Ligand binder design. Structure first.
Ligand SMILES: Cc1ncc(CO)c(N)n1
Ligand SMILES: Cc1ncc(CO)c(N)n1
Lengths: 254, 254
């Protein structure tokens, strides 16, 4: 298979279940050389977040450039963005290097629970970043927050929000309940475990790493979910942490 | 195979060839769930280091605790330590949690070239950390710097330094030219590529991930080298960077 390099722009998880740790693992498992730009450090854990350590937007920018000025990036996954300046720096580099296949997960809350959404950040995100993502993967609350609209009550409202997100620049949207939105139309798409830490990061990283090997987003959405389901299906064979464990990114190898 | 969790305490490489990126990849490739504590961020590249970003020793400490207070660690690899306070914080946690199978690579220089050795750090390292490592993997210049002795001229001197490092606390020493030193005795151990970025990190991470599946350090040193050789043997099939590329951590899977 052709060599594809994948890049992740996100936060860190020392326990290795979420963040760039999960993104990098997922890329590896799905056949892609992995690159990563850190936007924030966090003493995280299988039992929640202990603390967050901020990084200077300038260094994030420095990291982006160290990568884009040297390695050809075929797919990109974006996780935790933290603040307005990071969002801006990221969008700017994405625009300068004509980066495509950008998958944007919506990390605007928190595992332990907490709306990590800087009101100034969200506005910058919808105006400066959205117009550059190939696929956005929000759940209902997140979709609502991005649109600054009420939490979808019915299926119709949920479909309206997907279409609204497209008009804002996104090439595609995967509303997680799962519905995939494209200019063409919509498409509809079993967890038996409690160890689901990092699922979101993993799904988005997977969608990113898989995109270059498929015809359409639908095709890639289909394979990534199948794969993620297999990862969850083995989550319990892992012995990490006392709280909620991660999925088994390498179920297919060991 | 029994589940083994591996932990890396080191710096970052955004291009994914060295640092915790390489460590985490290597763990993954060799069947171990990976954990990582970041000691320093660096806008690095296949063409060298652009800049280094310091992290508060306290956060390093916070990271160690987030991990050791939740995940059972079976093997540990230590890379970039940066400064005295980090070395101290690391040694302290290693001591508190009776951490074993500690593999310490000697990152006291720089890819682009530069002795990243804080004279205060090196002294703290030999007094506080060395007594807790299972295996140290220095090359000649590094070995000399740790011993504060002249660069070994002959084989005898090289053997003297290995034995001296044992007396300082190290359970084993792998002097890279390669000689493995143990209480028992010594043991002696082809690169056709130019893309060797991250080799050192990869070897140490491999030795760490492999240790728990072998009888002795000799046995594990043997397998890790064979594996690393295969990784180098495919380094050229990768398309990352313009300078010196990384090895192919996943030669065995894709
Ligand atoms: C750094 C980071 N990014 C994303 C998530 C998802 O909850 C997390 N827990 N941590
Ligand atoms: C973070 C990091 N650790 C170790 C090395 C090896 O010189 C490197 N280039 N980068």
């Amino acid at each position: 298979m052709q060599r594809i390099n994948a890049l992740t722009i996100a936060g860190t998880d020392p326990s290795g279940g979420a963040g760039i740790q999960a993104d990098l693992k997922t890329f590896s498992a799905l056949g892609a050389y992995g690159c990563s730009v850190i936007t924030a450090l966090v003493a995280e854990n299988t039992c929640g977040v202990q603390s967050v350590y901020r990084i200077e937007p300038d260094f994030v920018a420095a990291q982006l450039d160290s990568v884009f000025s040297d390695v050809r990036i075929d797919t990109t996954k974006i996780g935790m963005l933290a603040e307005t300046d990071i969002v801006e720096a990221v969008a700017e580099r994405l625009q300068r290097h004509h980066v495509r296949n950008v998958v944007l997960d919506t990390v605007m809350l928190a595992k332990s629970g907490d709306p990590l959404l800087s009101p100034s950040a969200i506005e910058t995100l919808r105006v400066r970043l959205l117009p550059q993502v190939s696929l956005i993967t929000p759940n209902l609350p997140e979709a609502a927050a991005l649109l600054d609209a009420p939490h979808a009550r019915t299926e119709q409202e949920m479909l309206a929000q997907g279409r609204a997100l497209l008009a804002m620049g996104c090439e595609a949207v995967l509303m997680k309940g799962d519905w995939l939105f494209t200019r063409e139309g919509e498409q509809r798409f079993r967890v038996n475990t409690k160890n689901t830490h990092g699922t979101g990061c993993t799904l988005s990283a997977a969608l990113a790493a898989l995109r270059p090997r498929h015809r359409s987003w639908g095709e890639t959405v289909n394979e990534a979910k199948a794969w993620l389901s297999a990862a969850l299906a083995q989550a319990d064979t892992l012995e990490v942490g006392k709280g909620i464990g991660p999925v088994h990114h390498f179920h297919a190898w060991w």
